[PDB]
Design a protein around this ligand. Structure first.
Ligand SMILES: O=C1CCN(c2ccccn2)CC1
Lengths: 39, 156
């Protein structure tokens, strides 16, 4: 039995930590909603 | 139940203790999450019940109480923020420049950030605070790192 609990407002934060790269990938999406890499 | 707009954890007491299985967004009286988080099951909010209204396994999305309301889109150029809500941890914003998933049916923004599985459904936002999609359906790339699509629904 699943339940929900509030965790916060949805707002942009000035000076949030900035990280992560920006890869460009060829991918395929199957009927079950799974992504896979195309090589 | 609580109907205030914002980000929510999705919990279950079926397993050991209270376990966070995902996250979602309440907007315009509709609860939005990824299909793999709830598998389309009903949800509780206090003493109230939220019933599924629309869902699609291939898009990996589900809405409760009404139709999908989120329609903002990544502009393809700017940094966005993941409003990560990890299990047992405070909601925290992380800013990043999305990458791209190129598919036979068009290109989708993607965020290269890894969190515990129960973080699925966390919203990705633009500079106006609009939700441009949900985090949690992605792929593991060559060097072993995780990249999530920015998954967005259609507002009819
Ligand atoms: O919300 C999440 C679900 C997907 N997940 C994964 C999946 C495979 C490898 C690494 N992280 C990140 C967290």
């Amino acid at each position: 039995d699943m339940y929900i609990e509030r965790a916060g407002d949805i707002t942009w934060e000035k000076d949030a930590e900035v990280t992560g790269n920006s890869p460009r990938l060829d991918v395929a999406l199957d009927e079950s909603g799974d992504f896979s890499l195309v090589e | 139940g609580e109907t205030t707009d914002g980000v929510y954890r999705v919990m279950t007491r079926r397993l050991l203790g209270s376990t966070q299985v995902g996250v979602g967004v309440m907007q315009e009286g509709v609860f939005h999450t990824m299909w793999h988080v709830t598998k389309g099951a009903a949800l509780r909010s206090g003493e109230g019940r939220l019933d599924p209204y629309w869902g699609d396994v291939k898009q990996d999305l589900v809405s409760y109480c009404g139709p999908w309301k989120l329609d903002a889109a990544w502009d393809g150029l700017s940094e966005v923020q993941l409003l990560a809500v990890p299990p047992g941890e405070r909601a925290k914003n992380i800013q990043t420049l999305p990458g791209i998933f190129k598919t036979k049916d068009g290109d989708i923004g993607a965020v290269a950030l890894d969190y515990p599985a129960g973080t699925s459904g966390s919203p990705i936002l633009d500079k106006c605070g609009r939700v441009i999609g949900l985090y949690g359906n992605g792929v593991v790339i060559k060097n072993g790192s995780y990249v999530s699509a920015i998954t967005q629904g259609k507002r009819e």
